[model samples]
Target chain A: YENIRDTIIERAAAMFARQGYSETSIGDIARACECSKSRLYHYFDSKEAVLRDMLTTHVDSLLERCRQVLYGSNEPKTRFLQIVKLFLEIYATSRDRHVVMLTCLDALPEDQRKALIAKQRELIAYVRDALLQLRPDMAANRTLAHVDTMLFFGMINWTYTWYKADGSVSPDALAERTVQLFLDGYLNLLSA
Target chain B: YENIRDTIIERAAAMFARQGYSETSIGDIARACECSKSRLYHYFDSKEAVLRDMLTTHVDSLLERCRQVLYGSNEPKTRFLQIVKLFLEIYATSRDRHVVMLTCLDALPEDQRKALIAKQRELIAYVRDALLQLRPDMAANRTLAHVDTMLFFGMINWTYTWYKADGSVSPDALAERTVQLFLDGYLNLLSA
Candidate 1:
C-alpha cells in the first residue's frame, strides 16, 4: 500500500504539473500510474485527495529539512549557505512536486488550502528570522527586514522555472553565488 | 468598440487572476464587467482570446519600456538600475495583469501561448544582454550569465507576490535595494 501510494503521488505530480489540475481526471492518474481507478482510489478518495497528499507531503518535507538546517551548530553565514544549497537541491530534484505546489494549490479546498499556506508561511518566517539574526541592523526597521526576506526568496523560489540539473552550473555553485549576491550587498550597506 | 474591449480585458484579468482561469466562465467575466455575454463576444471570440489579449498586451508593454531603458545614455550599472525601476513600477502598477500573465498563460491556445512565451523570452534576453555588458567577464561563460539573469529576475518577477503599493516600502526604494544587492555581488566578482 505504501509503495503504491508513493507511486501514485509521483505520477500524479508529473501529470498535474504538465496539465493543469482541473483538466486532469482520476482516470488520467490511474492510466499514468498503470493501475485501475479502483486501485488509485484505494489510496486517494478523489483527485483532490491526491493533490492534497502531494502538496502536504511536499511542504512537510521542506519544513522538516529547514528545521534541521536552521538548528545546526554552524555559524549564521555557513548555515545560510547550507539552506540555499538545500533549496536548490530540492527545486532541482523535485521539480514536478514544486511546480504542482506553486501552480496547483488553487485546486485544493478552502481549509486544506489555508493549512498549506500557513505551513508555507512558517517556512518563510524561519528563513526570515535566520536572515535577521545574520544582520541585526535590518531589525531596526521591521519592513526593511520584510522586504529583504522576500527579495531573497524571490530569487530562490522561482528557480523551478529555469533550473536544469544537466546544465553547466551545478546546484552548489549556484547556491554560493546566490548567497554571495545577498550577503555582499547586505555587508556593503552595513559598512556604509 | 475599443473602449468596451479595454474594459472587458481589465475586468476579465481581475477575475482570471482571482479565480483560476479554467474555472472562470464567460458569464463570470461578463458579470464582472457588467456586460452581457454577447457583448463580450462582440469583442473577443472566446475567453481564451481575452486571456491572449491580456498576456500579449502585458508583455508588449514590458518589452517597449525595456527597449527605452536599454538604449538610454546611462552607464551599464546606471542603466541596469533604471531597468530595475522600470520593472518594479510595471509590476506594482499592473499587478493584476502581471498575475494574469504569470498564471493564466497556460490557458491560452498553443499559438497564442507560444507567441506570449516568445515575447517573454525576448524581455529576459534583453536583461541578459544588459547584464553581460555590465559584466563582460560573464560573457566568457554563457551559463553564468544565464544564472545571473535568472537570479535577477527571481528577485524582480516575484515582487508581485509581496509588493503592496500602500505598504511600507515604495516601489522606487525597493527597486534601488534590489539593484544594489545584485550589482554588489557582480562588482565583487568582477574585481576578484
Candidate 2:
C-alpha cells in the first residue's frame, strides 16, 4: 500500500463520528486500522491531532469547493444553488465524511474550530447574498432574510439525523425539495 | 442545604445541555456545584449514569404530557396543534433538558439509548394516528403521515442549534411557522 497514515485517519474519522472524541482511543484507532498505538502516533501525535487533521483537511476541501462554486458563477442564484448542490452531493455519496464533518468537527481544538466557524460564516454569507440577489425586495428586509436562511440551514443540517442514502428520497431530490420549500416562503407565495 | 446529589445532577444537566456530554466532565460538574469529584461520584456512578438518569427522566415527563394531551383531545386539528404546542412548550422553555434528550441521549449506554428510541417511536405513532384521523382519505398512506410528522419534529429538534429565546419570535410563533410549512405541503394549500 502507499502509506498507513491515510488508513489511520480514515478509521479515526469514522470512530470519532460514531462515538465522539472522548470515547475513542488511540488504541482503538490503531486496532481499527490494524496497527499499533505507536504507529498511529507516528502519523499523528495524539487523538486530538488526528481529529484536528481530519477536520481541518475536510474543511479545506470544502473551502476549495466553495471558492470554485462561488467564483465560477456570475448569477448569485446559480452560485447559491451550486453551494447547496455540492453539499447534497457530498452527503449523498460520502456518508462517513458527512458524519465526520457535521458531528465530530466540534471536537477540534480552539484555533481549528475558529477556522471552521469562519468558513461556516462565509458560507452563510454567500447564501444570504444569493438570496438577496434572487429576491431584491426581500433583500431590503434584513430580519426575515436572516431567519429564513437560518431555518433553511437548520433544515439541511438536521437532515443527517434522519436521511438515509437508500431511503426513498435521493439527495438531489431532497436538495430540490428544500430549494422549493425555501423558495415558496422566500417569495411569499405561501398563499399562492 | 439541598442534597449534593441533586445539585450535581442539575448542574450536570445544564452543562450537558449547553456544551454537550462529550465536552462535560465529572470534575466540571463538581467544580460548578462547589463539591469534590468524590462527592459527585457518591451520587452518580459515572458520567454515563448521570446522562442515563437525566434523559430517561426527561423522556418520562414528556411522555406523560404527550399522553395527557393526546387523550384529552378528540378533534384532529386540535390534537395535532396540541402535539405541536406541547413539544414547543417543553423544548422552547426547558431547552437545556430538551437538548440533552434530543442530541446527547445517544451518548448514553446502549440499553438506555434503546429505551429512548422506543419512546420516540411511540410518540411518532401517536402523531401518525392523529394525522390519519384528520384526513380519512389519506389514512391508508403511511409514508405521507410519517414524513409530515418527521419534518415537524425536525423543525423543532433542530432549533437547539440556532434558536434564540431573546429574539422577537416566541416559541408559539416558531411552532406556527413550522406547522404551516408542513401543513401547506401536506394539504396542498395554495397558502399556508
Candidate 3:
C-alpha cells in the first residue's frame, strides 16, 4: 500500500508538472500510476491533495537542504558559495521536483499552499541572512541581495526550459558561472 | 464593428490574464464584454481565433514601438536607454498586456505560437545586437551574446511577478538599475 501510494504521487507530480493540475484528470494519473481511479483516491483524498503533497515535499526538502548548506559550515565565503551550489544541485539533480515546486504550487490546497509559502520564506530568509554575514557592507538594504537571488534563480530555474543533458555546460559549471557573475559584481571587495 | 471587436479583445485579454486562457470560458468573456455569446461569435471564430488575433495585435504593437525607440535616433546609447525606458514603461505601466503577454501565449494555436515566438526572437535580437555593439571589446560569439541577452531578459521579463507600481522602486529607476547592473557590477566599478 505504501509503495502504491508513492507511485501514485510520482505520476501525479509528473502530470502536474507537464499539463498543469487543472488540465490533468484523476484517471490520467491512475493510468500513469498503473492503478484504478478508486485506488488512487484511496491513497489521496483528491488531485489537489496529491498536489499538496508534491509541493509540501519539495518545499520541505529545499528548506532543509538550504539551511544545511548555509549553516552547516560557517566560514562566510564557503557557506555562501555552497548555498548557491546547493540551489543549482537541487534543480539539476531533481528535475521534476524542481519544476513542480517552482511552477505548480497554485494547484495545491490553500492550507498546504500557506505552509509551502512559509517554508519558501524560511529558505529566502536563510539566503538573505547569509548574504548579510557574507558582505556586511552591502547588506543594509536587502533588495540588491534579493534581486541577486532572483536573477540567480531566474538563470537556474529557467534552465528547465532550455537545459539538455547533452549540453556542453555541466550543472556544476553552470552553477560556477552564475556564482562568478554574481560574486564578481557583488561580493568582491576589490571594487569597494 | 471594429470598435466592438476591440472592446471584446480588451475585455478578453484581461480575463485571459487573470484566469488564464484554457480556464476561462467564452461565456465569461462575452459577459465581461457586455455582449451575448452570439455577438462574440460575430467577431471571432473561436477562442483560439480570438487569442491568435490578440497575440498578433500585441506583437505588432510591440515591434512597432521597439523599432521607433531603437531606430528613431543615431546614438546607440540613446537608443539603448530609450528601448529600456519604453520597455519598462509599457510592461510596468500596462499591467493587463504585460500579464497577458507573459502568461497567456501558449493558449494560442501552434501556428500562432510560432508567429509570436518569431516576433519575440526579433526583439531579443535587437537587444542582443545593441548590447554587443555597446560592449564591442567583448568577443561577439553569437552563442554567448544570445545567452547574455536571454539572461537579462529572464530577469526583465519576470519583473511582473514581483514589481509593484508604488513599490520601493519606480519604473525608470528600475530600468536604470537593470541597465547599470547589466553593464557594471553591484560593487562600484569606479572604485576599480
| Maximum-lDDT candidate | 1
lDDT of candidate 1 at residue A73, scale 0 to 100 = 47
Residue-level lDDT tens digits of model 1 in B1-192: 788889888888888878778778999888887777788888888888888888888899999998988889568888888888998888778888988877777787788789888998998898888877776655777766778789889888887677786677788989887876677742232210
lDDT (tens digit, per residue) of candidate 3 on B103-172: 6777666877898989988988888877766766443455555556666676577676656757777778
Question: Candidate 3 vs. truth: CA RMSD?
Answer: 3.5
TM-score order, best first, reads: 1, 3, 2
User: Which pairs of residues clash in candidate 2, taking residues 3 or more apart in a chain or in different chains?
Assistant: A190-B191, A191-B191
Q: Write the per-residue lDDT of candidate 2 for residues A75-184, one digit (tens) a residue.
A: 76577677888887877776676677777756677887888788777777777777667766656667656765676677677777777757787777667556655554
Candidate 2: segments with Cα more than 4 A from true spot: A1-3, A63-85, A131-134, A180-192, B1-5, B22-27, B36-46, B71-82, B129-139, B185-192
What value does the lDDT take at residue A156 in candidate 1? 85
All candidates: DockQ: 0.43, 0.25, 0.33
The Cα error of candidate 3 at residue A102, in Å, is 2.1
Report the CA-based lDDT of candidate 1 relative to the real structure.
0.81
Candidate 3 ranges with C-alpha deviation above 4 Å: A73-75, A142-152, A185-192, B73-78, B189-192
For each candidate, C-alpha RMSD in Å?
4.1, 4.5, 3.5
- Candidate 3 lDDT, A27-83, residue by residue in tens: 898888676778887778877888887777778888888876766885976787788
- Per-candidate Cα lDDT values, in order, are 0.81, 0.71, 0.71
Cα lDDT tens digits for candidate 1, A1-192: 788889989998988888778888898988888878888877878899999999999999999998999889469878888888998898779989988887788788999999999998998898888877777656677776778788889898878778886678888988987887677742242211
